[PDB]
Amino acid sequence: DPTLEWFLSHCHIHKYPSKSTLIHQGEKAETLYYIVKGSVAVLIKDEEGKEMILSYLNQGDFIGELGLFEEGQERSAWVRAKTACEVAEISYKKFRQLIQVNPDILMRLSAQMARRLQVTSEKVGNLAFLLVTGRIAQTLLNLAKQPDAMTHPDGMQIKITRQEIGQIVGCSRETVGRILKMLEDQNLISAHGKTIVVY
């Protein structure tokens, strides 16, 4: 749309190959990003290097916004390219001028921030209230209802590794393996290889 086209005209755009890191946790934040094309993962880590995926973000999503509103902040998480990405970037200083010219661009950003708070708060609830089986079940269901799901005779077919599931729900790949076997035993899914059919 015209508002995003205008905003993007003020950005400089860069390509990140798959698996490259756009944002490192702890970096001093002075830059806003916007995904023109591609997908990323937002990750945090514990003291042993275990990773949890806080969110995937996709085309049309802003990234690196959390430092915009107060000076001297650090990046709160790592952001890694899941595919080749084309990403627009703009200094906080320039973005603030754009906001004065047309606050609709701040409305667009803030809308995403609000949704992220909602979704992350839901995740808190899931971790606090659900067991690992329930979190894995809900994750498989949510992934089957995503745009990139594949139609299957028996339901919706998804592509995700045990490692990635573990990183979403907070458990080892071995634990994912055991729970997935349990779910197939219950005739709720089938596991082919890296492919899972959610009935």
Residue 84 binding: pick among a second copy, ligand CMP, none (C-beta 5-8 Å cut-off by kind): none
* C-alpha pair distances (Å), 119 with each of 56, 81, 115, 124: 11, 21, 6, 9
User: What is the rounded distance in angstroms from the CA atom of residue 172 to the CA atom of residue 177?
Assistant: 9
> If binding is defined by CB under 8 A, does position 54 make contact with a second copy?
yes
50 annotated to a ligand binding site: yes
Q: How far is the CB of 106 from ligand CMP (least distance, A)?
A: 15
Q: Which is nearer to ligand CMP, 154 or 195 (CB)?
A: 195
For residues 86 and 27, is the Cβ–Cβ distance under 8 A?
no
> If binding is defined by CB under 6 A, does position 79 make contact with ligand CMP?
yes
**Residue of 18, 21, 110, 161 interacting with a second copy (CB under 8 A):** 110
> If binding is defined by CB under 8 A, does position 61 make contact with a second copy?
no
> If binding is defined by CB under 8 A, does position 138 make contact with a second copy?
no
Q: Footprint of a second copy on this chain (CB under 8 A)?
A: 44, 46-47, 50, 52, 54, 65-70, 76-77, 99-100, 103, 106-107, 109-111, 113-118, 120-125, 127-130, 170
Binding-site residue numbers for 3',5'-cyclic AMP are: 49-55, 64-66, 75-76, 120-121, 128-129, 163-173
